[PDB]
From TrEMBL:
InterPro entries: Glyco_Hydrolase_99. It is a single-pass type II membrane protein. It is found in: Golgi apparatus membrane. It comes from the Bacteria. The lineage of its organism: Bacteria, Pseudomonadati, Bacteroidota, Bacteroidia, Bacteroidales. This is Glycosyl hydrolase family 71.
């Protein structure tokens, strides 16, 4: 078929499965959330928490689906249909090494639901406690062993792919042991080889040698807020792609529709980026496409805490809070606008 409605399998959308309901999970997990203290504020801070009631959830926006459980099969089915609408072929699943049965259950449900709609799943490996190259290898082995035969498990030209959040917290001399073909615990030329995509944060002076010396296969930028880092400043993307191509690396810029996290980080107003009826999203996605990259990542499907979500949101005013919403656009606008940009991306690919 050549209808311009097909999934794009070089488009990765960052997905969070940490939401709960009292009924399914025992608590409205993540809808309730601690308010972060000000890193530059007083020493006697009692910031408190967001209770995660119907009236007061840990987001500046409000989900169309309500305080949903990420364990709810019917929520998962709706999410996969939303992925189909957005034409986002790859769900990049947050992964925190929780080693508990409820997470294992969610991962299986997600894979199954994804496959029903021909969506693929890869893992976004987060900075879990004591993360290091040895337990990363062990966890990569576990994930590939457990899920590698699942039909929804993502592969690019035969290789799995992982995004590694805050990869800079691990020294290149450690990374090399895992990622150099010569490394003492290398995954290269093994059953566990994978495209490893590290987080490009700061200036080329620092990041270029880091990426080369760590032997990452590529890099992404994550942050939805333009200018938050050098990597998340879209005017740098042409130059970043040039370097990537010169050095055999895969550049996967992250684009987002906006940013606001002030419910959970009330001191962090400087990072707010307004959606302005979709123009912000358009500007950022346009920059990614114009940079001539082979793959794009979307921050995010449902990071509701950070207000970067493309998942449908609805207008809501409670006695506790007046939520932001999609303004002059319909709840599914960011899904359909994503499909539009996926089309433009494919057009120039
Ligand atoms: O200050 C809150 C800040 O937290 C996150 O970013 C973290 C870290 O993960 C990241 O590597 C660096 C990049 O400079 O910033 C840290 O403080 C993230 O949630 C961000 O959006 C937020 O503003
Ligand atoms: O997925 C990468 C990145 C995206 N932003 C959130 C990061 O996690 C951190 O912040 C959230 C709230 O936004 C907290 O709930 C987490 O505990 C914290 O680690 C995440 O790593």
């Amino acid at each position: 078929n050549n209808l311009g409605t097909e999934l794009d399998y070089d488009t990765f959308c960052f997905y969070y499965d940490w939401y709960g309901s009292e009924a399914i999970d025992g608590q409205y997990r993540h809808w309730a959330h601690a308010i972060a203290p000000d890193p530059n504020g007083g020493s006697g801070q009692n910031p408190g928490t967001i209770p995660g009631t119907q009236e007061s959830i840990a987001s500046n926006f409000y989900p169309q689906l309500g305080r949903y459980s990420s364990s709810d099969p019917n929520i998962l089915t709706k999410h996969m249909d939303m992925f189909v609408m957005a034409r986002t072929g790859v769900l990049a699943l947050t992964w925190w090494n929780e080693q508990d049965e409820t997470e294992a259950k969610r991962i299986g449900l997600i894979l199954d639901a994804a496959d029903k709609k021909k969506i693929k799943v890869c893992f976004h490996l987060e900075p879990y406690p004591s993360r290091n190259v040895q337990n990363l290898r062990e966890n990569i082995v576990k994930l590939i062993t457990r899920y590698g035969n699942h039909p929804a498990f993502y592969r690019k030209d035969g290789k799995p792919l992982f995004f590694i959040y805050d990869s800079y917290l691990i020294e290149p001399s450690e990374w090399e042991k895992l990622l150099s073909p010569g490394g003492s615990i290398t995954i290269r030329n093994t059953a566990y080889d994978a495209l490893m995509i590290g987080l490009w944060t700061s200036s080329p002076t620092v990041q270029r040698p880091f990426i080369l010396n760590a032997h990452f296969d590529g890099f992404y930028t994550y942050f939805a807020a333009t200018g938050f880092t050098y990597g998340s400043t879209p005017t740098n993307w042409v130059s970043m792609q040039k370097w990537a191509k010169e050095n055999g690396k895969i550049f996967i810029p992250s684009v987002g529709p906006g940013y606001i996290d002030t419910r959970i980080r009330p001191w962090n107003g400087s990072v707010i980026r307004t959606r302005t009826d979709g123009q912000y999203y358009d500007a950022m996605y346009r920059k990614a496409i114009e940079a001539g990259v082979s793959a794009i990542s979307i921050t995010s499907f449902n990071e509701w805490h950070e207000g970067s979500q493309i998942e449908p949101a609805v207008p809501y005013t409670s006695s506790e809070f007046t939520y932001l919403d999609y303004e002059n656009r319909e709840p599914d606008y960011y899904l359909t606008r994503t499909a539009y940009w996926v089309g433009k991306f494919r057009e120039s690919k």
